[PDB]
Design a protein around this ligand. Structure first.
Ligand SMILES: [Ba+2]
Ligand SMILES: [Ba+2]
Ligand SMILES: [Ba+2]
Length: 588
């Protein structure tokens, strides 16, 4: 007497597009744009996909399990709809068609998984997810990644590196030490004394263990220092002019509207002179230092809201100096990842096909860039533009036809900051998989996973020896979408239910306005597939209409009608007259 529809608007690995085509997304790693799984744990999503897993206090079921649950739910819904066709033959014909299409596709997908595991795993390429100590990505996935146009792996040189990298075709790549795991005792790496990593680490905190100072100055202090750099009545004017120039010069970078800023007068129009600053405001005297003059002029002319600081860089985390090998390692890895991010930006934007690591590992670049970064930290300067200026000085040799513009540099900085803040607590920094779901490619973003199309992998893994049948065009159908960011739920499923509610509202509306002819007209109106609207009748709407002040009028109108087939007239007389009770319907 009540029907709850079970098919949910969300399922793991399941994406249903606007044309009711079912796509199953095979996960590579967790993440949105940058992969959260690295080294040993790289395989944990594919393990979960194929066999389920239980870790980190969470229990995750296989795709086959989840899709079978889904199927079962669809079958319940279908059975529930067909029970109503015993009362009204047309009941929910469109919702039913859609559900059956989905069901059929899902059954085919479950078949494909089953036969993949059973019949096309002679080399145990997939079983090894279950049995191998530290699993490899299966070959098909490696092929997808290697041939990918919007996702790329980058591999770095942390001092204490891990040999268990799992992305074998990195775009960005630098020389590394010999992992401790390649030694008997498994405690410490065998160092190499060349390459980018070594020069960074060894320049930032050297063998004599002399610390590198980090003098991160604010906007205010940057200006005050730069201005005081020129020092040991007109003097006051020169001071104020140079000061204003530097201040506005620095301020117009975040907001051009600071162009109109003046330090020559106070807010009330009073002029900044000796008598005012020494005798009205008593903040300075004849023998006061210049810093105090600057401070006072600033205090006199600008309000506090000007000194709000810009977003911080990953390179400046609040330490006053690089005082250990570990700090040098951290900074080294940040610089490396910045370069990697540049490299990725250039690959995806078709500016270069080169590997920047190959370049920056060579001398004298490895030494020079480390030198400049150290100086930069010591001078309190922005680290990213150093790297950018060095790249631009060598853009030809890095495969770039032209230098990186300010816009592109800033975009790189934004991506680097965003991504690096996401992974900064990672146990291992050896490699990262970075995807761009805003660009054409075979890698997607769906439900917190960086994925590929399952049929892509299936075709690649079975080598085309198993026909896809009805699913032969889905891979290409998903590529036709405007984005590789797939919504986490399936609107096409929800709209199925929304249409029923819309029916209810329309019925209630046409009843309230006391129009019987239009209500009948509405009930017998067809969808684009030729299905009468009254196929969406349920207990609620049946009762709304049957028990209404207007029903006798609708009945007379229904008797008069000549355009309606007798079967539908009979359905309506039977369902709306006062044995033949439709169930109530609801959903999740
Ligand atoms: Ba003046
Ligand atoms: Ba596309
Ligand atoms: Ba009845």
């Amino acid at each position: 007497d009540v029907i709850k529809f079970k098919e949910p608007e969300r399922c793991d690995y399941l994406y249903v597009d606007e044309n009711n085509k079912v796509h199953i997304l095979l996960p590579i790693v967790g993440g949105d744009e940058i992969g959260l799984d690295n080294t040993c744990q790289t395989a944990v999503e594919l393990i979960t996909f194929f066999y389920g897993s239980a870790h980190s206090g969470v229990t995750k079921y296989s795709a086959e399990h989840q899709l079978s649950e889904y199927k079962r739910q669809l079958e319940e819904d279908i059975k529930a709809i067909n029970s109503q066709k015993k009362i009204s033959p047309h009941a929910y014909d469109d919702l039913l068609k859609e559900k059956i299409e989905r069901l059929q596709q899902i059954e085919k997908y479950i078949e494909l998984i089953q036969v993949l595991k059973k019949q096309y795993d002679e080399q145990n390429d997939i079983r090894q997810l279950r049995t191998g100590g530290i699993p490899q990505l299966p070959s098909g996935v490696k092929e997808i990644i290697k041939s990918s146009e919007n996702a790329f792996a980058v591999r770095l040189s942390p001092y204490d590196n891990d040999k268990f990298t799992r992305f074998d075709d990195p775009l960005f790549n630098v020389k590394r030490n010999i992992s401790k795991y390649d030694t008997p005792s498994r405690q410490a790496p065998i160092p190499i004394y060349e390459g980018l990593g070594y020069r960074l680490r060894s320049t930032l905190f050297p063998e004599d263990k002399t610390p590198t100072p980090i003098n991160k100055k604010s906007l205010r202090d940057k200006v005050k220092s730069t201005v005081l750099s020129h020092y040991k009545d007109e003097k006051l004017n020169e001071l104020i002019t140079n000061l204003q120039n530097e201040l506005v010069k620095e301020l117009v970078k975040s907001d051009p509207q600071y162009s109109k800023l003046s330090l020559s007068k106070d807010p009330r129009g009073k002029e900044i002179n000796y008598d005012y600053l020494v005798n009205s405001l008593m903040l300075v005297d004849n023998d006061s230092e210049i810093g105090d003059w600057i401070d006072t002029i600033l205090d006199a002319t600008v309000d506090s809201t000007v000194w709000v600081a810009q977003a911080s860089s990953p390179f400046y985390d609040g330490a006053k100096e690089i005082s250990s090998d570990r700090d040098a390692d951290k900074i080294s890895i940040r610089v490396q990842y910045l370069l990697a991010e540049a490299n990725i930006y250039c690959k995806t934007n078709k500016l270069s096909d080169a590997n920047f690591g190959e370049f920056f590992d060579k001398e004298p670049h490895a030494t020079e860039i480390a030198k400049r970064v150290k100086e930069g930290f010591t001078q309190g300067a922005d680290i990213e533009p150093i790297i950018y200026d060095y790249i631009n000085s060598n853009h030809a040799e890095l495969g770039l036809k032209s230098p990186l513009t300010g816009k592109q540099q800033q975009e790189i900085t934004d991506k680097f900051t965003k991504h690096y803040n996401t992974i900064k607590e990672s146990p291992h920094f050896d490699e990262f998989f970075v995807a761009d779901p805003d660009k054409k490619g075979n890698i997607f973003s769906h439900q917190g996973r960086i994925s590929c199309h399952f049929l892509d992998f299936f075709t690649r893994q079975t080598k085309g020896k198993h026909p896809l049948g009805d699913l032969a065009s889905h891979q290409e159908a998903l590529q036709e979408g405007t984005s590789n960011r797939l919504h986490h739920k399936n609107e096409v499923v929800a709209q199925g239910y929304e249409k029923l509610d819309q029916f209810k509202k329309e019925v209630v509306k046409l009843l309230a306005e006391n129009k019987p002819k239009e209500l009948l007209d509405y009930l017998v109106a067809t969808s684009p597939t030729g299905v009468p609207n009254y196929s969406m009748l349920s207990k609620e709407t049946q009762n709304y209409i049957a028990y209404n002040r207007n029903w006798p009028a609708i009945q007379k109108e229904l008797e008069k009608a000549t355009s309606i087939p007798e079967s539908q007239k009979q359905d309506l007389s039977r369902l709306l007259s006062r044995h033949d009770n439709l169930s109530a319907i609801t959903w999740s």
